[PDB]
Amino acid sequence: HLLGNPKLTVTHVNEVKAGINHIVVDSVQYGNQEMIMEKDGTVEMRDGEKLYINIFRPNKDGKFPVVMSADTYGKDNKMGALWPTLGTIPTSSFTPEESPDPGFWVPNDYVVVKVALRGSDKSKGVLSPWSKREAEDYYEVIEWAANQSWSNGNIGTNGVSYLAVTQWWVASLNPPHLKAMIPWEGLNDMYREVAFHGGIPDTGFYRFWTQGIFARWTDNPNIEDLIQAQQEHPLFDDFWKQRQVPLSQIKTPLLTCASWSTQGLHNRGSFEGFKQAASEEKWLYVHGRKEWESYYARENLERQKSFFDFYLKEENNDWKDTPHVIYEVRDQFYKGEFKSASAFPLPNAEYTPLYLNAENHTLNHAKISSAHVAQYDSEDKQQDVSFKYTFDKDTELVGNMNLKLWVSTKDSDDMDLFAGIKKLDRRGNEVNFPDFNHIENGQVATGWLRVSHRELDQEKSSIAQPWHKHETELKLSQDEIVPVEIELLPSGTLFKQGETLEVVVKGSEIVIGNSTPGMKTRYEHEETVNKGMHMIYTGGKYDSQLIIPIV
Ligand SMILES: [Cl-]
Ligand SMILES: [Cl-]
């Protein structure tokens, strides 16, 4: 049954033509699985635009729950040398990247819908990624699918990256047949999470990705110019306000994956997405491993299936026994302990200030009487200042950290600050983690702040996570000393007794380089306001401090 038919030969993806295909899929789990694929189905939007889709379904009678995903990357798409750190990603041949594998889902009696959103495949309409107008298009395909002859009315959305962002968007519209959702690592506020980091423009990945969309659909003259967008809209203004999902409208039952490894792209938002959703039924899975790798691991496919079985098949399984938070405490690279909790942020987090001392470059439990100033050269990529704490007992830090600094510059009216948290083993050697974008030489946590963008949103800011307004640039007179609070992105790490936490503040990127030379898969921040010495002031009135989430 689920052993498949070794007798049959597998269908190759360019054997399949418009219309009805009977195909034999190379299922990772279930062998040679027969099914029906409708290639180049169309769904008509309110305005008349046709979106193109693929439909994979069991070759049998009945109505089935529907698992759907939607993007603009190519519905028909089909690495060890090229991008060796992507890890192990097993899927059938009928699985575009990050989508639900019909070779897994369909033999378990689901329909899979793969949606090419507006401006992709054979649509030449407006392509405006991760906007409300795209979500409205998605809304209509969900509702269309609830009414078809192979459908049981129950639609669940699923998938990774772009295929997650679009889920946050469309769930915010509350489609009546959206019964469950799995945004498996997706941002939902482009200004704060991909276009800029603490107000500093992303000159790497962001551009890469937007340029990549242009290059894919070359005959489409209607692709939104997001490169110009970034250039024209340096503040969180009306353009960017429309690209922050209204998360608290989400009511749909929710399974979120966040990852400690994705800081600088999907990490901040996956957490905001779980936090802010109004969903009465919501669950969060957090891991410190690789992205696509973890989505397709059998363990996590079974986690997804158990969720969808309960909500789309309405089946009595034990899904609701799942703790609302399951999270990895990272010890080393591909080594840690999974724990559970009933909420994120962790209810038993004790936010603990550690005070910085520029005089001996320590962190400290108690305030520093003596006032002091640490300096570094902001244009020198080899220069930074560090502050370290060695733990006398095993300690786990899980959640947001907040670096609070007093700072000044003299050769400029603005400052770009790059913050990092590193772990140092008992020998004094840095302990590396998976980090963005699939780098293996990463650190514990990372965060950024253009200092003219230091204004706090008081009603959204908290002890562990500052929220910045991004509406007024408060430029600097020299040598004006100002308080900043920097958001270190969510992380989960064990510091054993005799291991060290190091805060690093720098004028440029702290971990340098990426896992694809000559290709900008990682954020880069090459457009900087930095000049001359940065001053970090500590001790006395200058209560510079790191707030840590001890759990
Ligand atoms: Cl937290
Ligand atoms: Cl906001």
Short mmCIF file of all heavy atoms in Angstrom, two decimals, residues 189 192 236 244 457 460 467-469, ligand 2:
data_model
loop_
_atom_site.label_atom_id
_atom_site.label_comp_id
_atom_site.label_asym_id
_atom_site.label_seq_id
_atom_site.Cartn_x
_atom_site.Cartn_y
_atom_site.Cartn_z
N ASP A 189 7.30 41.14 8.31
CA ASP A 189 7.50 42.60 8.37
C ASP A 189 8.77 42.87 7.61
O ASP A 189 9.86 42.82 8.15
CB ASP A 189 7.61 43.05 9.82
CG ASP A 189 7.88 44.54 10.00
OD1 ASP A 189 8.27 45.29 9.06
OD2 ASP A 189 7.65 44.95 11.13
N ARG A 192 11.65 45.48 8.87
CA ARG A 192 12.42 45.10 10.04
C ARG A 192 13.21 43.81 9.89
O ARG A 192 14.05 43.50 10.73
CB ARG A 192 11.52 44.97 11.28
CG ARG A 192 11.18 46.34 11.92
CD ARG A 192 10.19 46.23 13.11
NE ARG A 192 9.84 47.57 13.58
CZ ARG A 192 8.91 48.34 13.02
NH1 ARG A 192 8.24 47.89 11.94
NH2 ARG A 192 8.66 49.56 13.50
N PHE A 236 10.34 53.41 8.06
CA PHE A 236 9.13 52.62 8.21
C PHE A 236 7.88 53.42 7.91
O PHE A 236 7.08 53.70 8.79
CB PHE A 236 9.03 52.04 9.63
CG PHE A 236 7.88 51.10 9.81
CD1 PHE A 236 7.76 50.00 9.00
CD2 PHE A 236 6.90 51.34 10.78
CE1 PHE A 236 6.68 49.11 9.15
CE2 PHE A 236 5.83 50.48 10.94
CZ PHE A 236 5.71 49.37 10.11
N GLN A 244 3.79 44.86 6.48
CA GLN A 244 3.87 44.26 7.80
C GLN A 244 2.55 43.57 7.98
O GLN A 244 1.52 44.23 7.94
CB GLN A 244 4.08 45.32 8.86
CG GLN A 244 4.00 44.88 10.35
CD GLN A 244 4.05 46.10 11.30
OE1 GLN A 244 3.08 46.85 11.42
NE2 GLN A 244 5.18 46.29 11.98
N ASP A 457 9.54 52.52 20.35
CA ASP A 457 8.09 52.40 20.50
C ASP A 457 7.84 51.91 21.93
O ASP A 457 8.05 50.73 22.26
CB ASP A 457 7.53 51.45 19.46
CG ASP A 457 6.03 51.32 19.52
OD1 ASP A 457 5.44 51.37 20.62
OD2 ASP A 457 5.44 51.13 18.44
N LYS A 460 5.27 49.03 22.51
CA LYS A 460 5.67 47.69 22.05
C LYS A 460 7.03 47.19 22.56
O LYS A 460 7.39 46.04 22.34
CB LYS A 460 5.65 47.60 20.51
CG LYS A 460 4.33 48.00 19.87
CD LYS A 460 4.30 47.59 18.39
CE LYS A 460 2.98 48.03 17.73
NZ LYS A 460 2.87 47.57 16.33
N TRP A 467 11.57 47.59 20.63
CA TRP A 467 10.86 47.85 19.36
C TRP A 467 11.14 49.25 18.96
O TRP A 467 10.84 50.23 19.72
CB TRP A 467 9.37 47.68 19.54
CG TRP A 467 8.61 47.34 18.28
CD1 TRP A 467 8.24 48.18 17.28
CD2 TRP A 467 8.14 46.06 17.92
NE1 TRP A 467 7.56 47.49 16.29
CE2 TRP A 467 7.51 46.17 16.65
CE3 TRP A 467 8.24 44.78 18.52
CZ2 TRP A 467 6.93 45.09 16.01
CZ3 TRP A 467 7.67 43.72 17.89
CH2 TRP A 467 7.01 43.86 16.64
N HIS A 468 11.69 49.40 17.76
CA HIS A 468 12.02 50.69 17.25
C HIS A 468 10.94 51.22 16.29
O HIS A 468 10.47 50.49 15.42
CB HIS A 468 13.40 50.61 16.59
CG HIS A 468 14.51 50.32 17.55
ND1 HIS A 468 14.94 49.04 17.83
CD2 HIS A 468 15.26 51.15 18.33
CE1 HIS A 468 15.91 49.09 18.72
NE2 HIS A 468 16.14 50.35 19.03
N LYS A 469 10.63 52.52 16.44
CA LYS A 469 9.62 53.20 15.66
C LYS A 469 9.96 53.33 14.18
O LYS A 469 9.08 53.15 13.33
CB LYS A 469 9.37 54.62 16.19
CG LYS A 469 8.15 54.75 17.07
CD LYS A 469 8.18 56.08 17.81
CE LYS A 469 6.90 56.34 18.51
NZ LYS A 469 5.92 57.05 17.61
CL CL B 2 5.44 48.69 14.29
#
